[PDB]
Amino acid sequence: MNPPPPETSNPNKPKRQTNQLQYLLRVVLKTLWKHQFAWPFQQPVDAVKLNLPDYYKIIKTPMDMGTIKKRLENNYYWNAQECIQDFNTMFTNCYIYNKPGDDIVLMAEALEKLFLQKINELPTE
Ligand SMILES: CCc1c(-c2nc3ccc(N4CCOCC4)cc3[nH]2)[nH]c(C)c1C(C)=O
Numbered sequence: 001m002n003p004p005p006p007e008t009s010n011p012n013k014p015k016r017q018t019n020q021l022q023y024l025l026r027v028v029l030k031t032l033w034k035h036q037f038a039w040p041f042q043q044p045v046d047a048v049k050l051n052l053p054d055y056y057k058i059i060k061t062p063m064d065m066g067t068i069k070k071r072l073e074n075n076y077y078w079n080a081q082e083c084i085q086d087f088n089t090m091f092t093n094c095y096i097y098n099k100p101g102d103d104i105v106l107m108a109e110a111l112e113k114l115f116l117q118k119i120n121e122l123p124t125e
Contacts, residue, residue: 001053002046002056008071017075021083023080027118028119029068032114037107058097065090068083071083091111
């Protein structure tokens with residue numbers, strides 16, 4: 001069964017915009033989004049549709065690029081490290097749930113390298 005998706009806005013959580021958060025949305029997220037391997041990561045894992053009944057029995061901190069995008073659009077993060085942490089959570093969840101050699105893991109690995117490539121240099125303040 002599917003849990004509620006991660007929140008994308010919270011009235012108790014303070015919002016912020018930085019030059020690095022604008023970078024992560026405009027170039028990092030939006031370039032990754034257009035990659036040929038992006039499609040499995042553009043929305044939360046639908047355990048019912050994908051016939052993965054154990055996915056949320058294993059993954060207790062789910063994360064996907066659609067949630068990250070909405071969070072960036074809503075100024076949900078305080079800084080860039082908070083957003084990068086969500087990207088790393090998405091990738092690690094995929095390696096936790098699946099095994100080396102799986103097609104999904106090969107796709108995740110390709111996207112992680114491109115992500116690291118792009119966050120290697122970020123803008124300044
Ligand atoms: C292999 C199952 C899996 C997916 C995934 N399988 C998908 C199949 C179809 C779609 N579609 C979405 C809407 O457009 C039409 C096609 C999205 C999918 N995402 N993602 C992740 C992170 C995993 C893991 C780690 O097990």
